[PDB]
Amino acid sequence: SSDIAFLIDGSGSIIPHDFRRMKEFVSTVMEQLKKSKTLFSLMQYSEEFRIHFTFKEFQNNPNPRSLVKPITQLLGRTHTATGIRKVVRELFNITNGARKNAFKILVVITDGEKFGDPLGYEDVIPEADREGVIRYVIGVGDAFRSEKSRQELNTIASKPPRDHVFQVNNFEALKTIQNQLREKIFAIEG
């Protein structure tokens, strides 16, 4: 059994066109990953945080496209480290339908460097690792073309980064790593 949380950047750095494409990617990946005993959860982050659905909300309505299609973009800045904290503490929580024995998997989609966040990765990654949350990160756009900028993606992802970090040029190219992400997650869960 698998509890797979998505944490998606809803900052004003993402244009409406690209937000639709992110929503389509999450819809399709969740569809392709559906297995008996798989639950999904989705949080959107900027400088605010929105649980679109818990694992418990998913269990009672196990239809990803239905849950993702209606969401509105938050806009604002990019508090990625708080996003991860709230996923670990609020989405991977038995009160919200998370399961004791389950594979804990987090997919982070980010369009920008952390900015405005009262927390560093040092404040949140250690807790994530104690709770067994396996983290994949997708950095979209020019913000992660530098080798300096790509270190943030290595800080977020589970070790080794080689197996856990994806870089896509823009939201159009998001669909081009769909199958890779799925295969990495199937490699863990069967």
Side-chain angles (χ1 to χ4, degrees), residues 78-95:
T78 313
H79 300 193
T80 316
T82 302
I84 292 160
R85 174 171 280 184
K86 298 185 107 66
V87 166
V88 170
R89 290 192 181 181
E90 297 179 33
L91 296 198
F92 286 103
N93 192 316
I94 175 146
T95 310

mmCIF file of all heavy atoms in Angstrom, residues 78-95:
data_model
loop_
_atom_site.group_PDB
_atom_site.id
_atom_site.type_symbol
_atom_site.label_atom_id
_atom_site.label_comp_id
_atom_site.label_asym_id
_atom_site.label_seq_id
_atom_site.Cartn_x
_atom_site.Cartn_y
_atom_site.Cartn_z
ATOM 1 N N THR A 78 7.151 31.752 -2.942
ATOM 2 C CA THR A 78 7.512 30.331 -3.098
ATOM 3 C C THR A 78 8.089 29.781 -1.794
ATOM 4 O O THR A 78 9.317 29.712 -1.702
ATOM 5 C CB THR A 78 8.474 30.162 -4.280
ATOM 6 O OG1 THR A 78 7.921 30.903 -5.382
ATOM 7 C CG2 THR A 78 8.701 28.688 -4.591
ATOM 8 N N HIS A 79 7.240 29.383 -0.844
ATOM 9 C CA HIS A 79 7.690 28.863 0.482
ATOM 10 C C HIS A 79 7.784 27.341 0.438
ATOM 11 O O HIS A 79 6.990 26.680 1.101
ATOM 12 C CB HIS A 79 6.767 29.334 1.600
ATOM 13 C CG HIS A 79 6.682 30.815 1.762
ATOM 14 N ND1 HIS A 79 6.112 31.391 2.889
ATOM 15 C CD2 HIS A 79 7.061 31.838 0.956
ATOM 16 C CE1 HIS A 79 6.168 32.705 2.760
ATOM 17 N NE2 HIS A 79 6.734 33.001 1.583
ATOM 18 N N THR A 80 8.752 26.804 -0.298
ATOM 19 C CA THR A 80 8.891 25.351 -0.581
ATOM 20 C C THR A 80 9.182 24.550 0.695
ATOM 21 O O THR A 80 8.702 23.398 0.801
ATOM 22 C CB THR A 80 9.985 25.118 -1.632
ATOM 23 O OG1 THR A 80 9.787 26.104 -2.647
ATOM 24 C CG2 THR A 80 9.932 23.739 -2.260
ATOM 25 N N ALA A 81 9.961 25.102 1.624
ATOM 26 C CA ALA A 81 10.389 24.370 2.837
ATOM 27 C C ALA A 81 9.188 24.240 3.772
ATOM 28 O O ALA A 81 8.997 23.158 4.311
ATOM 29 C CB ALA A 81 11.560 25.067 3.501
ATOM 30 N N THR A 82 8.386 25.292 3.947
ATOM 31 C CA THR A 82 7.142 25.196 4.754
ATOM 32 C C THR A 82 6.189 24.209 4.075
ATOM 33 O O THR A 82 5.593 23.370 4.801
ATOM 34 C CB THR A 82 6.505 26.565 5.008
ATOM 35 O OG1 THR A 82 7.468 27.386 5.676
ATOM 36 C CG2 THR A 82 5.222 26.474 5.800
ATOM 37 N N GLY A 83 6.029 24.298 2.750
ATOM 38 C CA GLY A 83 5.229 23.326 1.980
ATOM 39 C C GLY A 83 5.577 21.909 2.425
ATOM 40 O O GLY A 83 4.698 21.212 2.864
ATOM 41 N N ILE A 84 6.853 21.545 2.414
ATOM 42 C CA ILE A 84 7.325 20.170 2.745
ATOM 43 C C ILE A 84 6.971 19.849 4.205
ATOM 44 O O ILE A 84 6.469 18.749 4.473
ATOM 45 C CB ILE A 84 8.836 20.006 2.460
ATOM 46 C CG1 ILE A 84 9.111 20.069 0.955
ATOM 47 C CG2 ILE A 84 9.373 18.713 3.086
ATOM 48 C CD1 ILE A 84 10.552 20.405 0.580
ATOM 49 N N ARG A 85 7.222 20.783 5.116
ATOM 50 C CA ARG A 85 6.868 20.602 6.543
ATOM 51 C C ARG A 85 5.394 20.242 6.628
ATOM 52 O O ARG A 85 5.084 19.249 7.308
ATOM 53 C CB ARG A 85 7.144 21.837 7.403
ATOM 54 C CG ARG A 85 6.644 21.682 8.836
ATOM 55 C CD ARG A 85 7.097 22.801 9.752
ATOM 56 N NE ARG A 85 8.460 22.554 10.168
ATOM 57 C CZ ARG A 85 9.130 23.305 11.033
ATOM 58 N NH1 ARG A 85 8.555 24.379 11.544
ATOM 59 N NH2 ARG A 85 10.365 22.988 11.371
ATOM 60 N N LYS A 86 4.526 21.046 6.022
ATOM 61 C CA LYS A 86 3.062 20.870 6.193
ATOM 62 C C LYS A 86 2.652 19.528 5.568
ATOM 63 O O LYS A 86 1.774 18.908 6.102
ATOM 64 C CB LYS A 86 2.278 22.038 5.593
ATOM 65 C CG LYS A 86 2.563 23.379 6.237
ATOM 66 C CD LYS A 86 1.688 24.501 5.699
ATOM 67 C CE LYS A 86 0.630 24.942 6.695
ATOM 68 N NZ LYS A 86 1.242 25.569 7.896
ATOM 69 N N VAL A 87 3.238 19.114 4.450
ATOM 70 C CA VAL A 87 2.957 17.780 3.859
ATOM 71 C C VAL A 87 3.327 16.671 4.863
ATOM 72 O O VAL A 87 2.520 15.789 5.134
ATOM 73 C CB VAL A 87 3.745 17.610 2.561
ATOM 74 C CG1 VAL A 87 3.743 16.153 2.147
ATOM 75 C CG2 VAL A 87 3.190 18.487 1.463
ATOM 76 N N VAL A 88 4.543 16.707 5.398
ATOM 77 C CA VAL A 88 5.030 15.686 6.369
ATOM 78 C C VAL A 88 4.083 15.654 7.589
ATOM 79 O O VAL A 88 3.646 14.571 7.952
ATOM 80 C CB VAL A 88 6.506 15.957 6.722
ATOM 81 C CG1 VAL A 88 6.990 15.096 7.888
ATOM 82 C CG2 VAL A 88 7.395 15.760 5.502
ATOM 83 N N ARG A 89 3.690 16.804 8.130
ATOM 84 C CA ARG A 89 2.972 16.895 9.424
ATOM 85 C C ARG A 89 1.462 16.790 9.240
ATOM 86 O O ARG A 89 0.812 16.275 10.165
ATOM 87 C CB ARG A 89 3.256 18.222 10.121
ATOM 88 C CG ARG A 89 4.683 18.321 10.634
ATOM 89 C CD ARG A 89 4.858 19.500 11.555
ATOM 90 N NE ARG A 89 6.232 19.556 11.977
ATOM 91 C CZ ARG A 89 6.733 20.452 12.800
ATOM 92 N NH1 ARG A 89 5.966 21.401 13.292
ATOM 93 N NH2 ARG A 89 8.003 20.391 13.143
ATOM 94 N N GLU A 90 0.926 17.294 8.128
ATOM 95 C CA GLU A 90 -0.541 17.396 7.920
ATOM 96 C C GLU A 90 -1.047 16.331 6.929
ATOM 97 O O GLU A 90 -2.114 15.725 7.224
ATOM 98 C CB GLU A 90 -0.908 18.820 7.509
ATOM 99 C CG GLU A 90 -0.588 19.813 8.603
ATOM 100 C CD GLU A 90 -0.911 21.252 8.248
ATOM 101 O OE1 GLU A 90 -1.890 21.484 7.517
ATOM 102 O OE2 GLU A 90 -0.167 22.129 8.691
ATOM 103 N N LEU A 91 -0.349 16.076 5.824
ATOM 104 C CA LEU A 91 -0.816 15.059 4.843
ATOM 105 C C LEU A 91 -0.419 13.649 5.297
ATOM 106 O O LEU A 91 -1.215 12.726 5.083
ATOM 107 C CB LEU A 91 -0.269 15.381 3.451
ATOM 108 C CG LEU A 91 -0.758 16.703 2.851
ATOM 109 C CD1 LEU A 91 -0.538 16.727 1.342
ATOM 110 C CD2 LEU A 91 -2.227 16.921 3.171
ATOM 111 N N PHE A 92 0.754 13.460 5.890
ATOM 112 C CA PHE A 92 1.172 12.108 6.338
ATOM 113 C C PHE A 92 0.768 11.909 7.795
ATOM 114 O O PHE A 92 1.625 11.505 8.586
ATOM 115 C CB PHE A 92 2.645 11.885 6.048
ATOM 116 C CG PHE A 92 2.871 11.657 4.582
ATOM 117 C CD1 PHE A 92 3.382 12.654 3.779
ATOM 118 C CD2 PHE A 92 2.559 10.432 4.017
ATOM 119 C CE1 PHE A 92 3.592 12.426 2.433
ATOM 120 C CE2 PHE A 92 2.806 10.193 2.679
ATOM 121 C CZ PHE A 92 3.293 11.201 1.885
ATOM 122 N N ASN A 93 -0.522 12.125 8.078
ATOM 123 C CA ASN A 93 -1.129 12.175 9.425
ATOM 124 C C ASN A 93 -2.328 11.238 9.434
ATOM 125 O O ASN A 93 -3.200 11.350 8.536
ATOM 126 C CB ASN A 93 -1.539 13.598 9.802
ATOM 127 C CG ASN A 93 -1.900 13.735 11.267
ATOM 128 O OD1 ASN A 93 -2.606 12.907 11.834
ATOM 129 N ND2 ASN A 93 -1.421 14.782 11.899
ATOM 130 N N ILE A 94 -2.386 10.345 10.433
ATOM 131 C CA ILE A 94 -3.399 9.252 10.518
ATOM 132 C C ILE A 94 -4.795 9.889 10.580
ATOM 133 O O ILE A 94 -5.704 9.322 9.975
ATOM 134 C CB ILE A 94 -3.113 8.274 11.688
ATOM 135 C CG1 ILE A 94 -4.224 7.223 11.838
ATOM 136 C CG2 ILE A 94 -2.868 9.029 12.988
ATOM 137 C CD1 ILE A 94 -3.756 5.849 12.292
ATOM 138 N N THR A 95 -4.936 11.056 11.218
ATOM 139 C CA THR A 95 -6.204 11.830 11.292
ATOM 140 C C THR A 95 -6.707 12.198 9.887
ATOM 141 O O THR A 95 -7.917 12.452 9.750
ATOM 142 C CB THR A 95 -6.030 13.129 12.090
ATOM 143 O OG1 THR A 95 -5.390 12.799 13.323
ATOM 144 C CG2 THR A 95 -7.342 13.826 12.381
#
